[PDB]
Amino acid sequence: GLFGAIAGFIENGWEGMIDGWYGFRHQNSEGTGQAADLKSTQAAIDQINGKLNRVIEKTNEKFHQIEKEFSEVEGRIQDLEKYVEDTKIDLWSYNAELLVALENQHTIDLTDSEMNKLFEKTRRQLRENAEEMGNGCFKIYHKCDNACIESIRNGTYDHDVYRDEALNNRFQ
């Protein structure tokens, strides 16, 4: 929510996306398509799984302790024991709350950061043949086929082949 990609200039999510968490969707001169992006999906999944393994890892092992339930009324010692127990419980519940509160915020922020990173990388790939329309889509000013998009998806777009006709289409 800090970078303004998810719930920002990206209006809403896609429910037809079942391969990965982030993907593309192109409208071409032959028909519509759809794909996924394994790189960002795996990055986000690895970070979230690392955090999960960090929190759920086991630490506690206690065998013999104090009495915590009493049946009669004695005095100073019993009052002190109940005080000790109650202090411990009240100090652990606060940690339990704060940890979850912090980690949810961080998880939301990192999942919002991956989307912006993917967008900025794609923008830097289409050097000066495309223009951003403000809602997440790019407008490309030359003619691609299904063999043009797959090159922007796996990092082999050669902008020096379409640069002149894009410059002629978008400035005149």
Binding site: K68, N104, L118, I140
Partner: protein
């Protein structure tokens, strides 16, 4: 057309999960996980710890040697389970500093009892009482000795016992509080008794208290129970001239993982590492809301009932 279009986006689901953050208290994500275990199977499973079921016996009764507690001889445990239906059926007694002795015996984990040869000259041993029937006749505790007068006199008992071994020894002894002043001179001819138990670093002296008390199982007299710990190299001495409940030997003291717990859940044949009075609970989650009394590799007790951790992105449906 002479152009194209390439849009980017993320995925969404029809129904998400509500989680809390630093700012917002209810935000919708695509997935979450639960972090607080809030249920138990109801059974106590017997692996990989050693569970001993104290069906009708408390720990002090099985220690002193109650007649109906005679199957808990030389037993060992990792967790003693005391039921709420337990009762005593022997001579009425009372232990000053009861919790100290209970927690001292429970944390040792053994009832192994070695018999030592004491020599009480001038008195009659093996006293009984119809309030502690052992079979068809009268009896007493199995680890204590009731010394009375021999014919017409009761001399001054003075005995000693050294510790040449390399472990601690636990001695349990007691004193007898009669009901009247005629019950005294008919068991111990001296009109007043006294018990002194001493080591090279400690001493305990008790004087009996004659008086009437409420009828419990048919008697108005009582027995007070004391204990002593003898460390290696030391030596125990006992001195008395009346009202002595003598020991017969010593229990052995150990150190490790052992405890006691009050619960009424039945016992089963699973594998589980954490035990609560409500039963055993799995410990794959970091927190817990079942009970604050635990034994083993358990989670931690918190006051909350649900704490969800987000494992996805924010859900923004179409």
């Amino acid at each position: 057309n002479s152009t194209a279009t390439l849009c980017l986006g993320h995925h969404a689901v029809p129904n998400g999960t509500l989680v809390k953050t630093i700012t917002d208290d209810q935000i919708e994500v695509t997935n979450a996980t639960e972090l607080v275990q809030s249920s138990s199977t109801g059974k106590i499973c017997n692996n990989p710890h050693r569970i001993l079921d104290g069906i009708d016996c408390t720990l002090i009764d099985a220690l002193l040697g109650d007649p109906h507690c005679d199957v808990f001889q030389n037993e060992t445990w990792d967790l003693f389970v005391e039921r709420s239906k337990a009762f005593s059926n022997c001579y009425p007694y009372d232990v000053p500093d009861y919790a100290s002795l209970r927690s001292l015996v429970a944390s040792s984990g053994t009832l192994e009892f070695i018999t030592e040869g004491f020599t009480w000259t001038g008195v009659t041993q093996n006293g009984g009482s119809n309030a502690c029937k052992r079979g068809p006749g009268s009896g007493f505790f199995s680890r204590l000795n009731w010394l009375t007068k021999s014919g017409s006199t009761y001399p001054v008992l003075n005995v000693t016992m050294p510790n040449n071994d390399n472990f601690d020894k636990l001695y349990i002894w007691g004193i007898h509080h009669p009901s009247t002043n005629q019950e005294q001179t008919s068991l111990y001819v001296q009109a007043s008794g006294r018990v002194t138990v001493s080591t090279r670093r400690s001493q305990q002296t008790i004087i009996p208290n004659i008086g009437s008390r409420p009828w419990v199982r048919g008697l108005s007299s009582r027995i007070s129970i004391y204990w002593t710990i003898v460390k290696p190299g030391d030596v125990l001495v006992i001195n008395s001239n009346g009202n002595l409940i003598a020991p017969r030997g010593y229990f052995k003291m150990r150190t490790g993982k052992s405890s006691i717990m009050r619960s009424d859940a039945p016992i089963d044949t699973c594998i589980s590492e954490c035990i609560t009075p409500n039963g055993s609970i799995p410990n794959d989650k970091p927190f817990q809301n079942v009970n604050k009394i635990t034994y083993g590799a358990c989670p931690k007790y918190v006051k909350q009932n649900t704490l969800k951790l987000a494992t996805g992105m924010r859900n923004v449906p179409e």
